[PDB]
Symmetry: C3
Subunit: 115 residues, 3 copies
């Protein structure tokens, strides 16, 4: 079966350094919690709120080991007044036997308010 794994985080400032640092952190956290192997990943969708323009969060996937063939693309999240600002989210589609109720979705930084 195929399951989606969600992840979310926030950054303090709109800079390449922080965006890449925290996006990388979010991804390693997801891979750690779910024991994810790159060949099992169907695709990955990254999104950012309309207040981040510094860099494409996907550039961080390059620092991971063996993830060069995983198709990734970046979308803009819906602008909702009063919603979480400066946020980066992940929707990783993977093949797994793990039941839907046991998938480890990851919420870090100020995005803990979403858990």
């Amino acid at each position: 079966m195929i399951r989606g794994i969600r992840g979310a985080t926030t950054v303090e400032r709109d800079t390449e350094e922080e965006i890449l640092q925290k996006t990388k952190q979010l991804l390693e956290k997801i891979i750690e919690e779910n024991h994810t192997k790159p060949e099992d990943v169907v695709q990955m969708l990254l999104s950012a709120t309309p207040d981040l323009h510094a860099v494409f969060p996907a550039k961080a996937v390059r620092e991971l080991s063996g993830w060069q063939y995983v198709p990734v693309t970046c979308m803009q999240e819906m602008d909702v007044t009063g919603g979480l600002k400066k946020s980066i989210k992940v929707m990783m589609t993977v093949q797994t036997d793990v039941p839907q109720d046991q998938i480890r979705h990851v919420y870090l930084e100020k995005a803990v308010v979403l858990r």
Copy 2:
């Protein structure tokens, strides 16, 4: 096999009440037509046109029964001059044996013009 099920609707005003009411309606309609069980749903992607800011359409999934483990995320739809305004769309990825030509995609309200 895994198939995508599409859905679309529109709202008259940008308010939490109507957005949640019609998004919930759209989702129940999709679940009804396709006999969808939450454990069979891989992931769900909701999108809204750039003219809706009242609330995240996903907040409506909470009122459904047994859908708390289904990963959902909201994106902004491409702004196309002359396109359907005040619209909420769904891209539900599910496991099913039903042939691609027999999947019941749902178009409600002013979004009937898309069928």
Copy 3:
């Protein structure tokens, strides 16, 4: 197994004619390289940078043969200062036996800089 196939292209001007011409070209190129049959396609996600408003890139799928039942939806790509302008991207999810490292992702026009 299910795999994502990525594609990217660019257009010179924001017009219906060029957007549809190059999006169609991108899609035929992907179908050619990967030997894609419409019944094997789970879903398709098209995205455009916030500088294209002429038409929905998905309107081009209509000119393809046997692709009327493939669920497709359009999102807006994240606005990144200095990123590729006037770009249309594809994230096609398909069923295939082909290893992740052998999937043919397609980058055309000024989007060759992404390969």
